[PDB]
């Protein structure tokens, strides 16, 4: 009774209920619902529980020279608050918290949580190395930081719990609502390769269609490896519908029997494709029913290096592959090599798979390479079905700190759509680092919701991971999460039925949000709520006067609360926008690899002041964005003193205007220069260079930044038009604009050093979240196979055609947008 309540809550915090089992033709769910339990508890029973209570958000990397340059005589002060006093103490870079701490006892146990935030600065770590430390010397900032109590531990309180030849008979297909023809096509598949291929004849396409046909493959039972698919689909010559089936099951059993599989419709490559789930609804879908019942030469060197140093989207040809085979051993001293190596392998061939696992048993190279995320992420991606494969892939993966893990993390959930088997290594790791780290199970948490609410084809699977996750977060989080997922509910209700309500704000409709948002405040909206974006800030009552319907297409939601946090320093308030229409899962996609591409610019000492704002998808077409500060938009600077025509003085005047002092409006010129060129090469690289300059937004201290990312004649590389020039000082060239392009071809040169990571992460999203011709684009725009000074110009390049370009694709986006 207390045990069937508690997985109702779950089913609520959850947005699926896990004990389903009206849409499984086996028990591979449950089978990884009971496999997940050790993992969890292990976890759970290894954590420390006072710095898990406390998650203290830490990085090893070192400091970089942009924040050494900006703290003087080796001392960084800090103020601490306590009742109503607070006193700035002088503190080394390299000291701790504990050290700090005895210092603010001496001069005249407790925790140093900071200011208006969850957010604790504690454990065995330099000062220097704590985020938020980091993040206050970036935006030069003073820390704030308050004297108090530790939390109790035990609110995170766990509650206590063979020769012979494969063949398929194909009896049938059926539809309950429909003169052309129609063809059932069988294929073996694994990790995108079609090992062999089967196809039944022609019959007229009616509301039920038989076969009875055994389709014999010429693969035998033997030689079939383990995550090979079964992949039935169906052509009337265009595909309509497609349903796989695991040849060999989660126990290592051959599948055998009578199967009724509900298909999915279409509408070149997608992750939905790949899954093992059937179609929910059995109303109105198509179904298929089967029965189952069964040393080297020089130039040889050469050859292979150039094969080794390609890119992961060079495709590689039968002599390539043999090649790469032949000298496997050889092969195998390159980390860089096994994905084409592993790809190399002909993996419906048992002895082959054989060697190739007496081969993983030599893997001491691979064991002892640095760390490569873009290597380690390409052995998750499609092309790899096999487990044991994989797995080494996410033994790399272990040596992640929660920081690293942190950056990869969407992208890391997204990859389960890879794998063959809901219980694996990948899945086993998210819900191991999730519950060693509050931060990284809090987004783990939205990740894993987000695909759960609008992803019919890994709900399931997904689903299962979260109830994982959430028996073992703790009772604290547990009551976070519900809080959350409270709020947005309530609010995604409001959006909906005021979007329902010519695309003039009316006065009615101003009334109306006004009436709603009271009404919940009043009823059930909680004091206080995580941000979801954010899980350091609680946001508390909404702040109904400041709220309002924006005049756009979608009619979205701003939303302003106030922070519930009584030692917060400012009395600023917390913006969220909630909009139904645009897909923000592609936003969440994008807006990730920008906070890599920040980290890769870290590296080399660059800080391009990209604004990557918090977005949570929360379900189809909907979800939250954080509203940047103090920001409008280009196109509305334009609007404001044009009416609709493009001078170039503008957005510099508006620069001035928004500024107090002339020390200020440099700062926002400098600001504006690396910001631009921070957005030109990200915006590049990614193919979504060509923008509307509604979609470009700068704030009031010059931070430009571009929004809306879902759903991406003359063409521009970018947006560099004559107005951003302008407050560069060009009509020519300027010291603003030659820092610009200093900076443009440093950040462009320092991304290109990470091209592999790139073109795998690109190449995931595609799959996971929006053909081969449109991930190639990602090469072209990284200039792969180029030296640096040919790499040099070629950005230089881009710069000339949008200095040439002017105004003209900005103004035909216009008339697009006039229709
Ligand atoms: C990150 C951010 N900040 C601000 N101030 N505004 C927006 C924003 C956005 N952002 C956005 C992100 C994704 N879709 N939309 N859309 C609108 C529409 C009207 C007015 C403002 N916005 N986004």
């Given at each position: 009774?207390?045990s069937?309540?508690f997985?109702?809550?779950?089913?609520?915090?959850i947005?699926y209920d896990?004990?389903?089992?009206?849409?499984?033709?086996?028990?591979?769910?449950?089978?990884?619902?009971?496999?997940?339990?050790?993992?969890?508890?292990?976890?759970?029973?290894?954590?420390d529980?006072?710095?898990?209570?406390?998650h203290?958000?830490?990085?090893?990397?070192?400091?970089?020279?942009?924040l050494?340059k900006?703290?003087a005589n080796?001392?960084?002060?800090?103020?601490?608050?306590?009742?109503?006093?607070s006193?700035?103490?002088?503190?080394s870079?390299?000291?701790?918290?504990?050290?700090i701490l005895q210092?603010?006892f001496?001069?005249?146990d407790?925790?140093?949580?900071?200011?208006?935030?969850?957010?604790?600065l504690?454990?065995?770590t330099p000062?220097?190395?704590?985020?938020?430390?980091?993040?206050?010397?970036?935006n030069?900032?003073?820390?704030?930081?308050?004297?108090?109590?530790?939390?109790?531990?035990?609110?995170?309180?766990?509650?206590?719990?063979?020769?012979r030849?494969?063949?398929?008979?194909?009896?049938?297909?059926?539809?309950?609502v429909?003169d052309?023809?129609?063809?059932?096509?069988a294929?073996?598949?694994?990790?995108?390769?079609?090992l062999?291929?089967?196809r039944?004849?022609?019959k007229?396409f009616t509301?039920?269609?038989?076969?009875?046909?055994?389709?014999?493959?010429?693969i035998?039972?033997?030689?079939?490896?383990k995550?090979?698919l079964?992949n039935?689909?169906?052509?009337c010559?265009?595909?309509?519908?497609?349903?796989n089936?695991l040849?060999?099951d989660?126990?290592?059993?051959?599948?055998?029997?009578?199967?009724?599989?509900?298909?999915?419709?279409?509408?070149?490559?997608?992750?939905?494709?790949?899954?093992?789930?059937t179609?929910?609804?059995?109303?109105?879908?198509?179904?298929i029913?089967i029965?189952?019942?069964?040393?080297?030469?020089?130039?040889?060197?050469?050859?292979?290096?150039?094969?080794?140093?390609?890119?992961?989207?060079?495709?590689?040809?039968?002599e390539?592959?043999?090649?790469?085979?032949?000298?496997?051993?050889?092969?195998?001293?390159?980390?860089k090599?096994?994905?084409?190596?592993?790809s190399?392998?002909?993996?419906?061939?048992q002895?082959i798979?054989?060697?190739?696992?007496?081969?993983?048993?030599?893997?001491?190279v691979?064991?002892?390479?640095?760390?490569?995320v873009?290597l380690?992420?390409?052995?998750?991606?499609?092309?790899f079905?096999?487990?044991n494969?994989?797995?080494?892939?996410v033994?790399?993966?272990?040596?992640?700190?929660?920081?690293?893990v942190?950056h990869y993390?969407?992208?890391l959930?997204?990859?389960?759509?890879?794998?063959?088997?809901?219980?694996?290594?990948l899945?086993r790791?998210?819900?191991?680092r999730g519950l060693?780290?509050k931060?990284?199970?809090?987004?783990?948490?939205?990740?894993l919701?987000?695909?759960?609410?609008?992803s019919?084809h890994?709900?399931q699977?997904?689903?299962?991971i979260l109830?994982?996750?959430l028996?073992?977060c703790?009772?604290?989080?547990?009551?976070?999460?519900?809080?959350?997922?409270?709020?947005?509910?309530?609010?995604?209700?409001?959006?909906?039925?005021?979007?329902?309500?010519?695309?003039?704000?009316?006065?009615?409709?101003?009334?109306?949000?006004?009436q709603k948002?009271?009404?919940?405040?009043?009823?059930?909206?909680?004091?206080?709520?995580?941000?979801?974006?954010?899980?350091?800030?609680?946001?508390?009552?909404?702040?109904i006067?400041?709220?309002?319907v924006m005049?756009?297409?979608?009619?979205?939601?701003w939303?302003?609360?106030?922070?519930?946090?009584?030692?917060?320093?400012?009395?600023?308030?917390?913006?969220?926008?909630?909009?139904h229409?645009?897909?923000?899962?592609?936003?969440?996609?994008?807006?990730?690899?920008?906070?890599?591409?920040?980290?890769?610019?870290e590296?080399?000492?660059?800080?391009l002041?990209?604004?990557?704002?918090?977005?949570?998808s929360?379900?189809?077409?909907?979800?939250?964005?954080?509203?940047?500060?103090?920001?409008?938009?280009?196109?509305?600077?334009?609007?404001?003193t044009?009416?609709?025509?493009?001078k170039?003085?503008?957005?510099?005047?508006?620069?001035?205007?928004?500024?107090?002092?002339?020390?200020?409006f440099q700062?926002?010129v400098?600001?504006?220069?690396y910001?631009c060129a921070?957005?030109?090469?990200?915006?590049?690289?990614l193919?979504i260079?060509?923008?509307?300059?509604?979609?470009?937004?700068?704030?009031?201290?010059?931070?430009?930044?571009?929004?809306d990312?879902?759903?991406?004649?003359?063409?521009?590389?970018?947006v560099?038009?004559?107005?951003?020039?302008?407050?560069?000082?060009?009509?020519?060239?300027?010291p603003?604009f030659?820092?610009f392009?200093?900076?443009?071809?440093?950040?462009?040169?320092?991304?290109r050093?990470?091209?592999?990571l790139?073109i795998?992460?690109?190449?995931?999203?595609?799959m996971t979240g929006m053909?081969?011709?449109?991930?190639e684009?990602?090469?072209?725009?990284?200039?792969?196979?180029?030296?640096?000074?040919?790499?040099?110009?070629?950005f230089?390049?881009?710069?000339?055609?949008?200095?040439?370009?002017?105004?003209?694709?900005?103004?035909?986006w216009?008339?697009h947008l006039?229709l």
């Amino acid at each position: 009774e207390e045990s069937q309540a508690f997985q109702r809550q779950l089913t609520a915090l959850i947005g699926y209920d896990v004990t389903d089992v009206s849409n499984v033709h086996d028990d591979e769910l449950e089978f990884t619902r009971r496999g997940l339990v050790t993992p969890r508890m292990a976890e759970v029973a290894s954590r420390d529980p006072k710095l898990y209570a406390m998650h203290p958000w830490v990085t090893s990397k070192p400091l970089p020279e942009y924040l050494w340059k900006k703290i003087a005589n080796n001392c960084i002060f800090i103020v601490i608050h306590r009742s109503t006093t607070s006193q700035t103490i002088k503190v080394s870079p390299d000291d701790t918290p504990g050290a700090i701490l005895q210092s603010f006892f001496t001069k005249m146990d407790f925790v140093l949580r900071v200011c208006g935030r969850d957010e604790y600065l504690v454990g065995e770590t330099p000062i220097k190395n704590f985020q938020w430390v980091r993040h206050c010397l970036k935006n030069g900032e003073e820390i704030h930081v308050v004297l108090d109590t530790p939390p109790d531990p035990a609110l995170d309180e766990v509650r206590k719990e063979c020769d012979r030849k494969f063949r398929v008979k194909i009896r049938g297909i059926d539809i309950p609502v429909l003169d052309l023809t129609v063809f059932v096509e069988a294929n073996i598949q694994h990790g995108q390769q079609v090992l062999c291929q089967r196809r039944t004849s022609p019959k007229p396409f009616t509301e039920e269609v038989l076969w009875n046909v055994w389709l014999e493959f010429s693969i035998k039972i033997k030689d079939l490896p383990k995550g090979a698919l079964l992949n039935l689909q169906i052509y009337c010559v265009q595909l309509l519908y497609y349903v796989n089936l695991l040849l060999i099951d989660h126990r290592f059993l051959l599948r055998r029997g009578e199967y009724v599989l509900h298909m999915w419709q279409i509408s070149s490559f997608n992750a939905d494709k790949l899954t093992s789930a059937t179609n929910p609804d059995k109303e109105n879908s198509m179904s298929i029913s089967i029965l189952l019942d069964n040393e080297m030469p020089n130039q040889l060197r050469k050859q292979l290096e150039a094969i080794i140093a390609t890119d992961p989207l060079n495709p590689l040809t039968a002599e390539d592959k043999e090649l790469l085979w032949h000298f496997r051993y050889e092969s195998l001293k390159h980390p860089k090599a096994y994905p084409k190596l592993f790809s190399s392998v002909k993996w419906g061939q048992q002895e082959i798979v054989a060697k190739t696992y007496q081969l993983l048993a030599r893997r001491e190279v691979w064991d002892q390479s640095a760390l490569d995320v873009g290597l380690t992420m390409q052995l998750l991606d499609c092309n790899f079905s096999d487990e044991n494969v994989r797995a080494i892939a996410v033994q790399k993966l272990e040596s992640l700190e929660d920081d690293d893990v942190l950056h990869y993390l969407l992208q890391l959930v997204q990859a389960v759509k890879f794998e063959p088997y809901h219980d694996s290594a990948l899945a086993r790791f998210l819900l191991k680092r999730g519950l060693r780290n509050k931060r990284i199970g809090h987004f783990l948490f939205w990740f894993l919701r987000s695909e759960i609410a609008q992803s019919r084809h890994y709900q399931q699977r997904f689903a299962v991971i979260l109830e994982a996750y959430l028996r073992g977060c703790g009772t604290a989080m547990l009551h976070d999460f519900t809080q959350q997922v409270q709020v947005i509910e309530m609010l995604q209700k409001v959006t909906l039925d005021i979007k329902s309500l010519k695309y003039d704000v009316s006065s009615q409709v101003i009334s109306q949000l006004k009436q709603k948002l009271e009404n919940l405040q009043n009823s059930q909206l909680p004091e206080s709520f995580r941000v979801p974006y954010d899980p350091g800030l609680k946001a508390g009552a909404l702040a109904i006067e400041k709220c309002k319907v924006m005049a756009s297409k979608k009619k979205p939601l701003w939303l302003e609360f106030k922070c519930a946090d009584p030692t917060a320093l400012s009395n600023e308030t917390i913006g969220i926008i909630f909009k139904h229409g645009d897909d923000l899962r592609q936003d969440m996609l994008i807006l990730q690899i920008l906070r890599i591409m920040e980290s890769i610019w870290e590296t080399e000492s660059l800080d391009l002041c990209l604004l990557p704002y918090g977005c949570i998808s929360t379900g189809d077409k909907i979800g939250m964005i954080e509203i940047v500060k103090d920001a409008t938009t280009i196109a509305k600077i334009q609007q404001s003193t044009v009416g609709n025509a493009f001078k170039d003085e503008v957005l510099n005047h508006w620069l001035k205007e928004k500024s107090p002092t002339e020390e200020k409006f440099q700062a926002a010129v400098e600001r504006f220069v690396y910001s631009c060129a921070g957005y030109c090469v990200a915006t590049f690289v990614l193919g979504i260079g060509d923008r509307h300059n509604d979609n470009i937004m700068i704030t009031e201290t010059g931070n430009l930044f571009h929004i809306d990312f879902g759903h991406i004649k003359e063409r521009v590389p970018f947006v560099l038009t004559p107005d951003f020039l302008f407050v560069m000082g060009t009509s020519k060239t300027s010291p603003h604009f030659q820092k610009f392009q200093d900076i443009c071809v440093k950040a462009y040169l320092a991304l290109r050093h990470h091209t592999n990571l790139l073109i795998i992460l690109f190449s995931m999203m595609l799959m996971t979240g929006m053909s081969k011709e449109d991930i190639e684009y990602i090469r072209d725009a990284l200039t792969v196979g180029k030296n640096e000074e040919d790499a040099k110009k070629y950005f230089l390049d881009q710069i000339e055609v949008c200095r040439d370009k002017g105004w003209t694709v900005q103004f035909n986006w216009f008339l697009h947008l006039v229709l």
